[PDB]
Amino acid sequence: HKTRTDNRYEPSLDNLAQQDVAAPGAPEGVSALSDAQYNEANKIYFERCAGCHGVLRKGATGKALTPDLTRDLGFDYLQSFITYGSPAGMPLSAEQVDLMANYLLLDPAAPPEFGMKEMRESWKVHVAPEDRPTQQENDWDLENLFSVTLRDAGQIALIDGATYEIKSVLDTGYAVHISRLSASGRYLFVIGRDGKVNMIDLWMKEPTTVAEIKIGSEARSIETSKMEGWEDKYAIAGAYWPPQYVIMDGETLEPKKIQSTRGMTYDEQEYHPEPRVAAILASHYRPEFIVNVKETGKILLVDYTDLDNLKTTEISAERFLHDGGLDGSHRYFITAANARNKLVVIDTKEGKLVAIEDTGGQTPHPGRGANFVHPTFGPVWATSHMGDDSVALIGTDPEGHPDNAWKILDSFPALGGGSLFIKTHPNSQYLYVDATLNPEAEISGSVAVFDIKAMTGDGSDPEFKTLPIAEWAGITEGQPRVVQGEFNKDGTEVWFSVWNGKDQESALVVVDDKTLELKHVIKDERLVTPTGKFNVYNTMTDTY
Amino acid sequence: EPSLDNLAQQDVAAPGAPEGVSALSDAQYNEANKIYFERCAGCHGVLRKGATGKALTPDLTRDLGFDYLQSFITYGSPAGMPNWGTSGELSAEQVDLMANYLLLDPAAPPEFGMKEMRESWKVHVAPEDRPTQQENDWDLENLFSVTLRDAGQIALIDGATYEIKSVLDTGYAVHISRLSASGRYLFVIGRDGKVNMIDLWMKEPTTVAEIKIGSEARSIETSKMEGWEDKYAIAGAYWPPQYVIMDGETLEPKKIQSTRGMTYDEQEYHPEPRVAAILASHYRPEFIVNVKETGKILLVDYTDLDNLKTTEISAERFLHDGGLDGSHRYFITAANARNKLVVIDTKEGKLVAIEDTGGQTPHPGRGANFVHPTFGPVWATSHMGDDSVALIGTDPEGHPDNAWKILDSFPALGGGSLFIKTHPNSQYLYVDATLNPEAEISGSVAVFDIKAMTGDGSDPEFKTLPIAEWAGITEGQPRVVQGEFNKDGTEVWFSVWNGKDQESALVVVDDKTLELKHVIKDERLVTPTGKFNVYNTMTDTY
Ligand code: DHE
Ligand code: DHE
Ligand code: HEC
Ligand code: HEC
């Protein structure tokens, strides 16, 4: 129940917590909470507790807290245990503590479902396909555009990769989690934490939302079809609540196929009523989407060639699947079962699990990870960790380097714990590692940079250069967190977000990759809480 | 609709009552809970979300109010809801208990996962310790496995001598018997979710392994793809909503899959999609699983249980029973409440057709395949809701215009039919009328002569066999049910199903003459229902 460096990246169900619920009746031995009391506790539960314990209280990273279990424990125990407080989220009073203890002793209702009728009611096509351009009608350099989340403003900025000019600021769902691009690079898809999806046509003279839809109450992932021949055919979104994924028309967003992720855990084979959808990727080898289902530890390969006779492969992997990426060849999916410190590898060509390996670190959090050619080991993919300062390398070349394939080849320290994103590009000799969640302001405001060319894999700890990103941005207020490297199309410049509060000063910092010197500082009154940044070309092509 | 009398034995605690509702005591609530599962959940659902009967969740029931609930339960309505109070089935006090129970929030029904299955799993004779060849002198392929429903037993009966070879104790109300592809192993599943596996090669065949796969179950099947004989068995449950693939030699539970998910058409989450018929493909190493409420047919590939390949086919809601055509390539199944037959191509793994039978509530069992003299290969079903028999063409290559089209429909004895039957060596098509309200019809079977069918649009005549009268049984109300042939297809057996404290029988009819051959009677023959010949079941010959 204490804040760690790796227990802050747990779901916060703040959109779902805005829904009012009814107070249940209380069985003998338990006291009922009033309407107000129950809702107040429920809002606290959904915001701060459901991430680890579940909205249904069947347990996730934290153990189940169902009524039968909590009534055996008793109020006093619950009261005392909750008095300490709970692990903080991303950067309780006496009355609240009692509310939570009492709430846990009552029978929870399941939040509303969100099916086809609800999706179709939210589904709006602003510009039908026939009314859209048939060629690019603006003079922008679309492939070198960066789509940047302006988190708390419920907007995104589209920024020129070469001139750093903000080309447009568009209204979207609240706190967009990620931007994804169609395979052709024409269509930009964004998903808000509230399950709102916007689809934007980059060919319009003034790009804007051409279609929108809501796919759930809580959602974090979206992806587009990337198999050759299937460009622009489909998009897919994944939700935390309800536990489901939805395949939508790539041109209109019409919801075509909704699949529940409720099911059995892979290992103990017990029913789990809240298996959240985490990362979603798209295969380059088959016409399939790659869907991580967290609590059950299943990776789904979903064939989108026929949605009525639906072929899937449900791969037993490891529990607590979160994020991941494809290797350099784009054949193998490498993903973190973070709470179990493991990297699961799937062969997307053959449709099967190939390996599961412990990184030796605490809570691997790769993002999409970093693929590079290690001077001694050959092709490798890398991840950093939230729980410690380590960077781990896994071999990704079964054909050319069989002895190194799917083995952890090295592990070495970077700036500190609380890292979220590691980054490189084929044209760069550098490996960048952030330390976003580190409690030390100077560490959280800097990035470690390793010289891949100097790496020998002799067992020593490779040295790194420390780039003072937040210092370069010149922000005197607060303790801004630096997060997520993203390259430009040419792989010559790498951008970082200098993420401060909504009413505080933020920036983007552009680093010249060849020299590791400051290239440019992006500041604008409209640049509020900049977080994720996605270069059109690097996102459409999965170049990382 | 089903009766979930196994969930009723579970004792639950009295839930709380929100503002504006009375609470029931522990005893009252438990009494109401038992009634709810024993008599109500079939139609209304375990979770009260509604199946054939409307949803009875607290949000809906509280708007209706106590008086409305009391009245509806007392008097019922013409649209399929029994008059519990005025019929005397429920006392006045029990009616009120049920109305009050419906206003309260139900305690979640118990799940039944791997830990629970493994705890119930018993291997009486390890594979190594079993015979290596048949150690009895029985003609196993001509043996019949007969359910003695209310006695929680089955009877192994010799197909030629009609001798009851053995009466074995199994789960309560075994629903069906199924055979492994080699014909060695006999699998039975009780309504309670209890599975028994019996080794027919033993000197005295008995249960060699057993396991429980859920609270309420109706289906079991064995792997029938060439090369996969005896490898797996699969069981399907009504509750929890799931199927489980088990080791074909030990019953070890290997893979449990939930069937909770989205309806095919409106795409709305359904929390209780019951598993209905389960068949086994002869074209791929797959199981064919009907999921009723969501209208999905699952093709589950058992070649790799860790990297599990399935095909989830959108079909039609209310899927129940069905069978393979004569070629064993196409699965034809009744989406019964919608009066449709759904056809799946098991080779290509896709839906090929959905056709209305023109009848009310088709109920084929596994159906009846034959070569119609003018139409070609056809598959037939009778109906629960009317007296009709419908034929569908099953030959897309050889009779293209006729394929997957209803080619003819004609009357048999009356409504309430459950099973239609034929065999490749017979020229006759037998149709029961088990649930008909008239005793003369419920105790008789219609027999059509396939050779005389002209498909000229006229209705084919049938002979009426007085099966119950042949048995010498009038006492109570004996209902005749389900034709099953012997291995040679020269005799057909029917069950004369009477009450547990009444006299039942099995009637053996000579297929060549359509005359009474033999009547099987025994004090042990309590409530005989399903009968399965070893050879015809192992080979899917129907
Ligand atoms: C499931 C998931 C993905 C993979 C998406 C995909 O494959 O399309 C992901 C990726 C991401 C990515 C993808 C980067 C990439 O290069 O792919 C980014 C930038 C991101 C910025 C943040 N994430 Fe993320 N993130 C969650 C979940 C996820 N984040 C959370 O449940 C969580 C922990 C809290 C929450 O309630 O949302 C969380 C907090 C954050 C942040 O505090 C971040 C830093 C800021 C923010 O804007 O809200 N998450
Ligand atoms: C899901 C299912 C199947 C397919 C099994 C398979 O594929 O392995 C089936 C088949 C069957 C078969 C298979 C015949 C065949 O030749 O395949 C038989 C004999 C049978 C005897 C009965 N069934 Fe059955 N049956 C149900 C369900 C099912 N019955 C019910 O839910 C229902 C409607 C009510 C109930 O509570 O069980 C019901 C009533 C009956 C009867 O009243 C029968 C006659 C006796 C009994 O115990 O309930 N059912
Ligand atoms: C993720 C970091 C957590 C958050 C946020 C909250 N809890 Fe938690 N809780 C978590 C863990 C890792 C554990 C220990 C057991 C385990 O799963 O390994 C717990 C434990 C509890 C308990 C104790 C129950 C017991 O059986 O001893 C309670 C009562 C509990 N948690 C309640 C609770 C509440 C009310 C929270 C919101 C403020 C909350 N937890 C947040 C992990 C996490
Ligand atoms: C299947 C034959 C049923 C069984 C067994 C029970 N019920 Fe039922 N019920 C059924 C149907 C098809 C309907 C629909 C209403 C109609 O007009 O026929 C109902 C309805 C009810 C209702 C009314 C709900 C409403 O009007 O919205 C109630 C309160 C109800 N049923 C209760 C109930 C109980 C308590 C039962 C066990 C004793 C029971 N039903 C059995 C079908 C069937």
- CATH number, domain of B302, equals 2.140.10.20
Q: DSSP for A450-514?
A: EEGGG---SSS---EEEE-HHHHHT--SS-PEEEEEEE-TTSSEEEEEEE--TTS--EEEEEETT
For residue A170, the surrounding DSSP H or E stretch is strand A166-171
Listed in sequence order, the residues at least 6 apart from B495 whose beta carbon sits closer than 8 Å to its beta carbon are B146, B480, B481, B482, B504, B505, B506, B507, B528, B529, B530, B531
Residue by residue, what is the 3-state secondary structure of B338-388?
A: HCEEEEEECCCCEEEEEEECCCCCECCCCCEEEEECCCEEEEEEEECCCCE
Q: How many angstroms is it from A297 CA to the middle of ligand 3?
A: 21
Q: How many angstroms is it from B6 CA to the middle of ligand 4?
A: 20
Q: Which residues pair with A324 in a beta bridge?
A: A335
Tell me: do A303 and A358 sit in the same domain.
Answer: yes
Phi-psi region of B535 (alpha: psi -120 to 50; beta: other; left: phi over 0): alpha
User: Is residue A6 in a domain?
Assistant: no
User: Does the N-terminal peptide bond of residue B466 adopt cis geometry, omega within 30 degrees of 0?
Assistant: no
Q: What is the distance between the alpha carbons of residues A491 and A374, in angstroms, rounded to a whole number?
A: 18
Q: DSSP for A343-366?
A: EEEEETTTTEEEEEE--SSSSB--
Helix/strand/coil for B94: helix
Listed in sequence order, the residues at least 6 apart from B48 whose beta carbon sits closer than 8 Å to its beta carbon are B41, B55, B56, B57, B102, B106
Residue B57 lies in domain: 11-110
* Token digits of residue B522: 């025994």
CB-based burial label for A316 (10 Å; 0-12, 13-18, 19+): buried
A–B CB contacts, 8 A cutoff, strictly below: 123
Q: Whose CA is nearest to atom 15 of ligand 2?
A: B365
- Is-contact A379 A397, C-beta < 8 A? yes
**In A295-350, which ranges are E strands?**
298-303, 309-316, 321-326, 332-337, 342-347
* Token digits of residue B528: 């005989």
Closest by CA position to B181, among listed B231, B247, B130: B231
Closest by CA position to A148, among listed A188, A119, A187, A118: A188
By C-alpha distance, the chain B residue nearest A67 is B107
Tell me: do B160 and B253 sit in the same domain.
Answer: yes
User: Is residue A10 in a domain?
Assistant: no
Residue with tokens 């992997």: A317
Tell me: do A100 and A120 sit in the same domain.
Answer: no
Residue with tokens 């922000």: A475
* Phi and psi angles of residue B439, each rounded to the nearest 5 degrees, phi first: -55, -40
A:320-379 residues touching chain B, CB 8 A cutoff? 351-353
Report CB contact under 8 Å: B17, A23: no
Listed in sequence order, the residues at least 6 apart from B425 whose beta carbon sits closer than 8 Å to its beta carbon are B488, B489, B490, B511
Tell me: do A69 and A155 sit in the same domain.
Answer: no
* Phi and psi angles of residue B93, each rounded to the nearest 5 degrees, phi first: -65, -40
Q: Which of B5, B215, B218, B287 to mutate to test the pocket of ligand 2 (most atoms within 8 A of CB)?
A: B218
* Phi and psi angles of residue B441, each rounded to the nearest 5 degrees, phi first: -85, -40
Tell me: do A100 and A188 sit in the same domain.
Answer: no
First-to-final CA distance of chain A: 36
Interface test with A, best of B116, B239, B262 (most A CBs within 10 A): B262
Q: B398-407 long-range CB contacts below 8 Å, 24 or more apart? A: B399/B375, B402/B375, B402/B376, B404/B343, B404/B352, B404/B353, B404/B355, B405/B355, B406/B355, B406/B356, B406/B357, B406/B358, B407/B372, B407/B375, B407/B378, B407/B455
Listed in sequence order, the residues at least 6 apart from B340 whose beta carbon sits closer than 8 Å to its beta carbon are B316, B334, B354, B355, B356, B357, B362
Q: What is the distance between the alpha carbons of residues A248 and A255, in angstroms, rounded to a whole number?
A: 4
- Is-contact A294 A322, C-beta < 8 A? yes
Which ligand is closest to the CA of B57, given by its number? Answer: 4
Whether B43 has a binding-site annotation, put simply, is yes
Tell me: do A80 and A131 sit in the same domain.
Answer: no
- Is-contact B340 B357, C-beta < 8 A? yes
User: Is residue B44 in a domain?
Assistant: yes
Give the residue from A112, A138, A163 where a domain finishes. A112
Tell me: do B140 and B94 sit in the same domain.
Answer: no
Q: What is the distance between the alpha carbons of residues B362 and B412, in angstroms, rounded to a whole number?
A: 13
Residues enclosing ligand 3, CB less than 6 A?
A 1, 7, 10, 48-49, 51-53, 61-63, 65, 73, 78, 81-82, 86-87, 100
Dihedral in degrees, nearest 10, Cα atoms A114, A120, A126, A129 = 120
Identified catalytic residue from A284, A322, A374, A425: A322
Q: What is the distance between the alpha carbons of residues B447 and B466, in angstroms, rounded to a whole number?
A: 11
- Is-contact B417 B433, C-beta < 8 A? yes
Identified catalytic residue from A49, A199, A227, A540: A49
User: Is residue B5 in a domain?
Assistant: no
Q: What is the distance between the alpha carbons of residues A248 and A236, in angstroms, rounded to a whole number?
A: 6
Give the residue from A82, A112, A142 where a domain finishes. A112
CB-based burial label for A535 (10 Å; 0-12, 13-18, 19+): buried
Laid out side by side, the sheet with A234-241 consists of A218-224, A234-241, A244-249, A255-260
HSE (side-chain half, CA atoms, 13 Å) at A348: 26
Secondary structure letter of residue B186 according to DSSP: E
Count CB-CB contacts under 10 A for residue A125.
17
Q: DSSP for A87-149?
A: -------HHHHHHHHHHHHSPPPPPPP--HHHHHHH-EESS-GGGS-SS--S---GGGEEEEE
- Sign of the CA dihedral B16, B21, B24, B25? positive
* Token digits of residue B490: 């020269």
Which ligand is closest to the CA of B83, given by its number? Answer: 4
Kindly give the interhelix angle for A75-83 and A94-105, rounded to the nearest 10 degrees. 140
* Token digits of residue A3: 């804040």
Q: Which of A155, A156, A220, A484 to mutate to test the pocket of ligand 1 (most atoms within 8 A of CB)?
A: A220
Is A309 an interface residue toward B (CB < 8 Å)?
A: yes
Give the residue from B75, B91, B110 where a domain finishes. B110
Q: What is the distance between the alpha carbons of residues A344 and A366, in angstroms, rounded to a whole number?
A: 12
Report CB contact under 8 Å: A313, B312: no
Name the residue among B268, B312, B313 with its Cβ closest to that of A115: B268
List the Cα angle B39/B23/A75 in 5-degree steps: 120
By C-alpha distance, the chain B residue nearest A351 is B307
Q: Which of B44, B70, B84, B87 to mutate to test the pocket of ligand 4 (most atoms within 8 A of CB)?
A: B44
CB-CB neighbors (< 8 A) of A242 in chain B: 269
Q: How many domains does chain A have?
A: 2
List the Cα angle A511/A516/A519 in 5-degree steps: 35
Query: Cα-atom radius of gyration of chain B, to the nearest Å?
Result: 23
User: Does the N-terminal peptide bond of residue A242 adopt cis geometry, omega within 30 degrees of 0?
Assistant: yes
CB-based burial label for A451 (10 Å; 0-12, 13-18, 19+): middle
Q: What is the distance between the alpha carbons of residues B313 and A307, in angstroms, rounded to a whole number?
A: 9
Q: What is the distance between the alpha carbons of residues A246 and A262, in angstroms, rounded to a whole number?
A: 14
Tell me: do B138 and B275 sit in the same domain.
Answer: yes
- CATH number, domain of B51, equals 1.10.760.10
* Token digits of residue B132: 């290596």
Tell me: do A153 and A244 sit in the same domain.
Answer: yes
Instruction: Give the catalytic positions of B in this structure.
Output: 40, 43-44, 81, 320, 363
Closest by CA position to B282, among listed B228, B359, B346, B225: B225
User: Is residue A323 in a domain?
Assistant: yes
Kindly give the interhelix angle for B92-102 and B26-35, rounded to the nearest 10 degrees. 90
Q: What is the distance between the alpha carbons of residues A320 and A61, in angstroms, rounded to a whole number?
A: 8
User: Is residue A13 in a domain?
Assistant: no
- Is-contact B14 B29, C-beta < 8 A? yes
- Catalytic-residue membership of A322: yes
Is A503 an interface residue toward B (CB < 8 Å)?
A: no
CA distances from B24 to A96, A106, B27, B37, B104 (A): 31, 17, 8, 17, 9
Tell me: do A103 and A215 sit in the same domain.
Answer: no
Helix/strand/coil for A255: strand
List the Cα angle A345/A351/A357 in 5-degree steps: 15
User: Is residue A24 in a domain?
Assistant: yes
CB-CB neighbors (< 8 A) of A271 in chain B: 111, 113, 240, 242, 258
Secondary structure letter of residue A65 according to DSSP: -
Listed in sequence order, the residues at least 6 apart from A459 whose beta carbon sits closer than 8 Å to its beta carbon are A410
Q: Which residues pair with A236 in a beta bridge?
A: A223, A247
CB-CB neighbors (< 8 A) of A269 in chain B: 113-114, 253, 255-256
- Is-contact A109 A28, C-beta < 8 A? no
- Catalytic-residue membership of A49: yes
* Phi and psi angles of residue B68, each rounded to the nearest 5 degrees, phi first: -60, -45
* Phi and psi angles of residue B47, each rounded to the nearest 5 degrees, phi first: -90, 5
Secondary structure letter of residue B434 according to DSSP: T
Listed in sequence order, the residues at least 6 apart from B437 whose beta carbon sits closer than 8 Å to its beta carbon are B416
Q: Whose CA is nearest to atom 49 of ligand 2?
A: B175
Report CB contact under 8 Å: A25, B14: no
User: Is residue A1 in a domain?
Assistant: no
Q: Whose CA is nearest to atom 25 of ligand 1?
A: A9
Tell me: do A172 and A84 sit in the same domain.
Answer: no
By C-alpha distance, the chain B residue nearest A56 is B108
CA distances from A149 to A153, A304, A534, A539, B470 (A): 9, 29, 9, 14, 82
* Token digits of residue B304: 């790799």
Dihedral in degrees, nearest 10, Cα atoms B303, B308, B314, B320 = 60
Number of helices (H) and strands (E) in chain B: give both, helices first: 9, 35
Tell me: do B202 and B290 sit in the same domain.
Answer: yes
- Catalytic-residue membership of A365: yes
- Is-contact B76 B95, C-beta < 8 A? no
